[PDB]
Write a protein that binds this DNA or RNA. Structure first.
Lengths: 297, 98, 119, 226
RNA sequence: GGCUCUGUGGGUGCUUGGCCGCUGGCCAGACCUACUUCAAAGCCACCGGGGGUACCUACCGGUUGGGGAAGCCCUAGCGGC
RNA sequence: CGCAAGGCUGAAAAAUUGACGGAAGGGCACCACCAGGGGUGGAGCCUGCGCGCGCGCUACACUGACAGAGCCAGCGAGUACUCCCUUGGCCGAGAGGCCCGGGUAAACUCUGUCGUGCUGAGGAAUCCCUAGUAAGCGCAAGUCAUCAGCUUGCGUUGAUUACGUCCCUGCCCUUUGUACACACCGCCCGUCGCUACUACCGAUAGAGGAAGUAGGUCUCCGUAGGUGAACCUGCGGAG
């Protein structure tokens, strides 16, 4: 099986490089299709590239289908997007403290298809092996400072990306009294996102919203009573977990039930949790001259 | 990877399973085998709203109930069950003052 | 390619053809009918045959060595041995083409890595 | 899946390889899978806790079968041996290595002796008798073996076909049949045919499983089901 | 005395003869070249993909000059349609 | 450059598909029951968060101390790594370097000496936990965010008790759909909205108020007509 996962990872990276080359070509093919239906004159290299003419007559249809959005991009999520329910486990670091254990239980309650596993003495390659063995969608680590969490590592499987993010301003579920809080309602939640426009922001939105089960589309606009919000300002994505009831047609009442984070992503690696040598995709560029002026996501 | 599934329909007749079998002198089925009509009673007849009479309605159990003979409370409760299913899926001065 | 570009059966059969060929490992991608037009190749089928695919998987040193081996009957794929050197390994069987059970080749590999388990 | 709803119930998982044999227990409480990751899995589904007890073997699993009185399971692996496990305490209670007991071979197009040939030395499919004491095993070979499950001895062996037209039905071929140009049952003899429909060779190259061409000269003998 | 190689015979599938112009002959062979009334039914027959077709070829439809089977007719013929 | 770019104005709906429930029946949950375990909360240290609160760390004796003997790991290699600050003295015109003083495991096993001796294991509550899990133990690293009052790895030793149940506490879902055989099941319930129609009430043909319902073939013959020998048609007859 591990042979199969290695083979698929290598073939996916090779198809990525092939898509890079073919997109460098198909930037030039699309000018030919647009100049055809319009009549505006085009560049002579485009007009006299004969191999481009043969290949264009072959492969018109995929560009048009991409324009109509009928087809999806070669991605780690478009294979199993909304067909299966992506189950996810949360663990702590090696020696968990009691507050980190309660916090992991809080976010295991936040994701409705999550299970929590104790680390104990569980070597991290055996963790990745067991996850790929039981077909888990995603894995989550947590690192405490002293009873307060500081880092998540959202890792997708079998070979997807990881997002390593630092946490601040966290308030745990397990500090308010049980007379005021209660058992959190486990329902399939809606998700709202705000501020993401770049391709990197879209990548983060995808690898975040592919941790939640897909919702039934027949009456999703009206039913459902629990929403999870991710807003970003100056690339520190802040997340709350609300549960709401709609007292009218023109007013709603909120009630904050989950933890609050302002997680700031400091790495996204194209390669899973065990692969420290995986090719990075974005990391928090500090110690440069303008790494604090530039705003990603 | 075999194929994506595509809808294929096959029509069945009322002829017996002894007409479904392959060509042989005497059937392997007994004397009870040979009267099974290859389609169920559910398909040879099923009471439904598209095959009821004019005034009467057919219920969920398959019993014809007449709209005349139903009382008002039965009509109200049946309307409620249907609604639950559907939910699951310049003037004059005198005219002003007086 | 000769159908009009907006035709539903053209799109469905294009995706079907590309998916079938990529799963059978002839092509390298699954997005270019042009790659079907001048990339599908008897050389591609030949390199998807068994001795060259085990050469790429480094079972043997050369393709001649691989053919000699699987003619001697050392190489199973899945659970059944293969004696024909023309078996076409697809992209799901490339992960399973291994040696046979009591092979002298398997013993020699184990003796090289000094993990020869005589049980 | 369930049969009364028609939709998929669940996707069980835990196997580091393709599953190759399945068996429900005749009392209707246990699933058993056997997969090429050298493992068997005692699945317990119908209780409130879906659990999976692993059974580690030495090689790939090729067949699983239940005793009728459901307390015993027998699994046939790729070495060619049968291991008899007890389903309550998941411990192996018996085992028989019947590689020599089933080895019958030398198909044409094989340059190994029938003694050394690998691929015909396992048990593809095993089944229990209706009494509960006699296991029957059959592999890709000329012999069907019939063991007992208490004394673990070879009660009886059978030969499936004395037909010489099939491939592996005698374990020692002869130099009379070997000519100078390879075996005399290997020269392509289609050309001296009078009908063009029999002269055409629409075979596909390297197609072990069925092709519409199906040259099929000297088919292999294999006890595919028992 | 041992290793190695090489050759011959038997076996590796259930035992009814060697040959021929075979109901008879021959294994030493023998005879040698005759006999004849009327050519033939048709179909099919696997070359890798896209592409040009000037030439040749295949197929179809024609054109000049001959050619006349067959069919039809009757003034009967070296006939006539 | 032009349009945008002129204030009956002065802060705090849709609905034939809609609103809220109830009863029954399921499924799931160490935020539930059940059996056990372990924290925190007692004393001191401190990061953190808002004097207080937790999180870690240390100490608190039978599981003892002392001395011998034996025997086990894994991840770790950037011409790189050092805990101070000083009394003196050597060689230093001067800046310094020297020399001497002061402030690859834990564990475990076996063998003996001695004997409980300020030399006391944490309330109410609340939280967590079900197999290489709890817990004990040390070694390494310090990886662009966080982390030395610590963080993350890695190995070692490794149990008790459930592994059933929806009874309590909750959460979800059925009562519509989504598939056909056998087989079963058999019209869940309430309060209103909205719509059509019907009539009613009273102020000025009229906007509101209140209410309910939804069966002569074949052959032959005699004919008459047709294109005549014949042949066809129609009719009337016999077989």
């Amino acid at each position: 099986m591990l042979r199969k996962q290695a083979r698929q990872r290598r073939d996916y990276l090779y198809r990525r490089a092939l898509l890079l080359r073919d997109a460098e070509i198909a930037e030039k093919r699309a000018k030919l299709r647009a100049a055809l239906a319009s009549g505006k004159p085009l560049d002579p290299k485009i007009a006299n590239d004969k191999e481009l003419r043969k290949d264009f007559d072959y492969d018109v249809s995929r560009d048009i289908a991409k324009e109509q959005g009928e087809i999806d991009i070669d991605d780690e999520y478009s294979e199993l997007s909304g067909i299966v329910d992506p189950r996810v486990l949360v663990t702590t670091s090696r020696d968990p403290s009691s507050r980190l254990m309660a916090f992991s239980k809080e976010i295991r309650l936040m994701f409705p298809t999550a299970i929590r596993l104790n680390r104990g003495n569980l070597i991290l390659p055996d963790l990745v092996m067991s996850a790929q063995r039981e077909r888990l969608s995603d894995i989550i680590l947590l690192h405490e400072h002293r009873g307060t969490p500081t880092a998540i590592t959202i890792s997708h499987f079998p070979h997807g990306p990881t997002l390593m993010a630092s946490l601040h301003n966290v308030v745990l579920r397990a500090d308010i009294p049980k007379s005021i809080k209660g058992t959190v309602s486990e329902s399939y939640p809606h998700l709202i996102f705000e501020g993401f426009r770049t391709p990197l922001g879209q990548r983060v939105v995808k690898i975040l919203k592919h941790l939640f089960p897909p919702r039934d589309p027949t009456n999703n606009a009206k039913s459902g009573n629990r929403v999870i919000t991710f807003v970003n300002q100056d690339d520190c994505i802040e997340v709350r977990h609300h549960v709401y009831v709609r007292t009218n047609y023109n007013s709603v009442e909120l009630s904050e039930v989950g933890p609050r984070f302002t997680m700031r992503p400091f790495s996204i690696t194209m390669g899973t949790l065990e692969n420290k040598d995986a090719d990075v995709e974005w990391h928090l560029s500090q110690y440069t001259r303008t790494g604090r002026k530039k705003n990603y996501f | 990877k075999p194929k994506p599934p595509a809808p294929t329909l096959t029509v069945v007749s009322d002829v017996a399973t002894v007409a479904m079998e392959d060509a042989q002198p005497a059937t392997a089925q007994g004397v009870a085998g040979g009267e099974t009509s290859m389609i169920a009673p559910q398909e040879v007849y099923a009471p439904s709203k598209d095959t009821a009479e004019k005034g009467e309605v057919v219920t969920k159990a398959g019993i014809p109930i007449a709209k005349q003979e139903m009382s008002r409370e039965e009509k109200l409760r049946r309307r409620r069950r249907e609604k639950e299913r559907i939910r699951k899926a310049v003037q004059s001065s005198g005219a002003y003052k007086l | 390619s000769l159908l009009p570009p907006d035709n539903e059966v053209r799109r469905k059969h294009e995706t079907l053809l590309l998916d079938k060929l990529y799963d059978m490992g002839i092509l390298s991608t699954k997005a270019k009918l042009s790659a079907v037009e001048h990339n599908v190749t008897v050389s591609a089928f030949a390199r998807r045959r068994l001795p060259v695919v085990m050469t790429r998987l480094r079972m043997a040193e050369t393709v001649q060595a691989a053919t000699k081996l699987i003619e001697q009957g050392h190489v199973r794929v899945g659970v059944e041995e293969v004696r024909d050197p023309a078996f076409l390994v697809t992209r799901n069987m490339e992960d399973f083409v291994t040696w046979t059970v009591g092979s002298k080749i398997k013993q020699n590999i184990m003796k090289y890595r000094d993990k020869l388990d005589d049980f | 899946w369930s049969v009364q709803t028609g939709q998929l119930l669940d996707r069980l998982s835990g196997h580091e390889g393709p599953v190759s044999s399945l068996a429900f227990a005749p009392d209707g409480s246990v699933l058993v899978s056997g997969s090429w990751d050298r493992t068997a899995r005692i699945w317990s589904i119908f209780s409130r806790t879906q659990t999976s007890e692993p059974l580690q073997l030495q090689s790939d699993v090729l067949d699983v079968a239940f005793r009728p009185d459901s307390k015993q399971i027998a699994i046939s692996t790729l070495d060619g041996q049968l291991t008899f496990w007890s389903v309550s305490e998941a411990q192996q209670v018996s085992g028989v290595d019947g590689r020599r007991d089933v080895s019958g071979g030398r198909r044409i197009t094989d340059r190994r002796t029938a003694a050394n040939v690998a691929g015909t030395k396992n048990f593809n499919t095993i089944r229990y008798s209706m009494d509960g004491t006699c296991l029957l095993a059959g592999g890709n070979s000329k012999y069907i073996c019939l063991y007992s499950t208490t004394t673990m001895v070879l009660l009886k062996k059978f030969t499936v076909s004395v037909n010489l037209s099939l491939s592996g039905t005698q374990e020692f071929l002869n130099s009379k049949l070997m000519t100078e140009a390879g075996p005399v049952g290997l020269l392509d003899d289609q050309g001296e045919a009078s009908d063009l429909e029999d002269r055409i060779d629409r075979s596909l190259p390297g197609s072990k499983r069925g092709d519409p061409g199906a040259r099929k000269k000297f088919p292999e003998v294999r006890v595919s089901g028992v």
